[PDB]
Design a protein around this ligand. Structure first.
Ligand SMILES: [K+]
Ligand SMILES: [K+]
Length: 155
């Protein structure tokens, strides 16, 4: 039974551990800009009016997804991460579709996101989910993070 809900920890550090496992899952050897802890992020997101979701297989946390309000009608998808062993079942898509229905019910008509240009598999999923390419920027930080900005209108 795959279940999607608002994230609720089984134990206080469950999210930290899940997130560290996702960051550790880097087989192509991409450079990583590490991120408060994810639990702090979630707390702040909820205080700002956002929401943070789990997907579980039985009791096992297998995915997460955040929604962060930009304004009255646009939300930003954030911290979207699936355990890569569940990528061929289309469970990333299942979690996103639940999150999207939630967004829609909440009065959002646009979801925006940004993603590293190196992350092919992620970009390909977002395309599959109906995100459209708006712009690329090499974000200077000197480290350059080539970044893809995408949106989806909801109906
Ligand atoms: K890289
Ligand atoms: K819903």
């Amino acid at each position: 039974m795959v279940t999607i809900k608002v994230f609720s920890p089984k134990y206080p550090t469950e999210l930290e551990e899940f997130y560290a496992e996702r960051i550790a899952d880097n087989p192509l050897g991409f450079i990583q800009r590490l991120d408060p802890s994810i639990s702090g992020f979630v707390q702040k997101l909820r205080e700002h009016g956002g929401e943070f979701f789990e997907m579980r297989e039985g009791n096992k946390l297998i995915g997460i997804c955040g929604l962060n309000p930009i304004n009255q009608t646009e939300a930003e998808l954030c911290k979207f991460h699936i355990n890569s062993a569940y990528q061929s079942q289309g469970l990333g898509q299942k979690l996103y579709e639940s999150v999207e229905k939630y967004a829609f019910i909440k009065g959002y008509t646009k979801i925006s996101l940004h993603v590293s240009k190196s992350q092919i598999k992620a970009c390909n999923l977002y395309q599959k989910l109906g995100f459209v390419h708006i712009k690329e920027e090499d974000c200077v930080v000197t480290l350059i993070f080539p970044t893809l900005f995408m949106e989806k209108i909801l109906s």
